[PDB]
Amino acid sequence: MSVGIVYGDQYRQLCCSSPKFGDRYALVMDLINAYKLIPELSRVPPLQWDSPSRMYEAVTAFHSTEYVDALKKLQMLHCEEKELTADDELLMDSFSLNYDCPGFPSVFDYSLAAVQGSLAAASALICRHCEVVINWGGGWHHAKRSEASGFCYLNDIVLAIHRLVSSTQTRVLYVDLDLHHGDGVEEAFWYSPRVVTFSVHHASPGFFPGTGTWNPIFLNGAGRGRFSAFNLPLEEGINDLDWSNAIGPILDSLNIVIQPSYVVVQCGADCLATDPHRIFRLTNFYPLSGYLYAIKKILSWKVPTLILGGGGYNFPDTARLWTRVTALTIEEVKGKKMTISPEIPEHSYFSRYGPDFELDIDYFPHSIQKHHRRILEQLRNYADLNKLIYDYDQVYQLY
Numbered sequence: 001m002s003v004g005i006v007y008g009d010q011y012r013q014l015c016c017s018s019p020k021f022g023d024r025y026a027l028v029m030d031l032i033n034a035y036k037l038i039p040e041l042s043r044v045p046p047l048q049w050d051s052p053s054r055m056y057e058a059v060t061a062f063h064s065t066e067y068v069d070a071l072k073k074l075q076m077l078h079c080e081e082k083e084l085t086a087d088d089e090l091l092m093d094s095f096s097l098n099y100d101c102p103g104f105p106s107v108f109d110y111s112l113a114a115v116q117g118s119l120a121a122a123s124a125l126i127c128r129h130c131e132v133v134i135n136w137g138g139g140w141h142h143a144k145r146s147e148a149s150g151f152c153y154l155n156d157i158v159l160a161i162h163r164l165v166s167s168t169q170t171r172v173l174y175v176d177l178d179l180h181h182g183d184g185v186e187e188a189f190w191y192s193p194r195v196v197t198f199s200v201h202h203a204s205p206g207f208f209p210g211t212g213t214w215n216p217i218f219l220n221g222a223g224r225g226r227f228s229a230f231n232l233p234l235e236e237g238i239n240d241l242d243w244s245n246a247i248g249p250i251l252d253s254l255n256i257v258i259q260p261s262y263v264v265v266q267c268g269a270d271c272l273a274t275d276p277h278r279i280f281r282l283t284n285f286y287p288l289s290g291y292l293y294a295i296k297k298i299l300s301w302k303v304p305t306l307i308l309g310g311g312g313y314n315f316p317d318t319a320r321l322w323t324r325v326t327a328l329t330i331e332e333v334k335g336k337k338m339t340i341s342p343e344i345p346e347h348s349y350f351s352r353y354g355p356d357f358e359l360d361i362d363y364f365p366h367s368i369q370k371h372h373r374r375i376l377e378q379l380r381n382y383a384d385l386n387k388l389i390y391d392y393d394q395v396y397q398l399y
């Protein structure tokens with residue numbers, strides 16, 4: 001079927017307006033365009049509303065009205081340059097709109113744009129216009145109902161998933177490949193068995209955000225959502241092959257047992273060896289990149305799939321990975337080989353890919369069993385609670 005991608009003049013401007021991510025979205029979309037992939041991709045325009053009331057209703061489907069009000073006020077205050085009052089500082093602090101989530105003149109428009117993009121992508125999948133939609137302007141998994149966290153202000157992912165499950169028994173599998181635990185998305189659906197969340201991440205004492213590991217039992221959801229939240233915490237230094245072998249059987253087993261109506265994939269690029277975090281050692285190599293291995297396996301299920309961005313602080317290498325992810329998605333969905341030159345094509349941001357100007361990232365690659373057994377038990381428990389019938393032998397053999 002069609003492969004959708006979210007972009008537009010306003011969307012590009014708004015996604016490039018944040019001080020933290022700067023022009024990362026521009027580099028990603030321009031590298032995709034420079035490799036002549038845009039004519040293969042169906043443009044999905046960001047969702048717009050008919051009234052401020054309809055926008056509020058859509059955003060407050062997850063977030064509190066007072067939090068959205070505070071975020072709007074923060075944008076207004078940063079627009080008309082004037083110091084915050086003591087009461088303003090206190091209000092912003094109550095919503096964690098202070099330290100890691102500072103104000104800036106376009107903070108609300110930037111945050112809302114990601115929601116508009118991911119909601120439009122969800123709709124495009126629901127009406128069966130595209131089989132896969134990509135939104136490199138989205139993937140902000142940390143935002144909570146009444147709290148900004150990790151430069152995530154509004155949770156585009158939660159609102160997209162909510163729209164998918166609200167459509168016409170619908171089940172959504174969320175896969176979070178970001179370096180960081182997808183705490184916001186996990187928490188939002190903590191009580192739902194219809195939305196299964198799976199985050200693979202680094203966890204270590206004091207490492208953001210501190211969740212998605214032991215606390216000495218593994219929390220995995222509550223009430224009807226019990227056993228429905230999956231986490232694979234991994235130690236520092238893991239490469240393409242070990243990461244692939246760690247998550248491969250989990251993805252296969254989750255797809256087989258859940259039989260999802262939709263798959264939502266957060267594809268945060270901060271696991272790359274060349275990310276300034278310097279924690280994981282993943283690449284964008286395609287002859288194999290763990291990212292490309294995971295995406296190819298997910299797409300092989302032939303389930304309507306939403307692919308989002310997220311983390312990734314090496315902007316050129318994030319662009320190199322996500323261009324490869326967009327080419328692979330076209331190949332797997334349309335069955336059309338997308339030949340990509342090892343040399344970065346001439347375009348606006350060509351100099352940003354120096355000094356080698358190659359598509360492959362400059363890197364030479366060189367405990368899980370216990371997690372696999374635990375996750376196999378959790379998946380059995382999930383199936384037993386929700387009365388899902390599956391071949392226990394088939395799932396066992398995958399690991």
Ligand SMILES: O=C(NO)c1ccc(Cn2c3c(c4cc(F)ccc42)S[C@@H](c2ccccc2)C3)s1
Pocket residue numbers: 020099100101102142149150151178179180208268270276277310311312313
């Ligand atoms: O990727 C994430 N979620 O998936 C993140 C959540 C919170 C994060 C932490 N984090 C980081 C920065 C930052 C800036 C912010 F305004 C808010 C959160 C921030 S500078 C970045 C860095 C790392 C190593 C070397 C130099 C710079 C780390 S990143």
Ligand SMILES: [K+]
Pocket residue numbers: 176177178179180181182199200201
């Ligand atoms: K993750």
Ligand SMILES: [K+]
Pocket residue numbers: 189190191192193195196197221225228229
């Ligand atoms: K859940």
Ligand SMILES: [Zn+2]
Pocket residue numbers: 178179180268270310311312
């Ligand atoms: Zn991250």
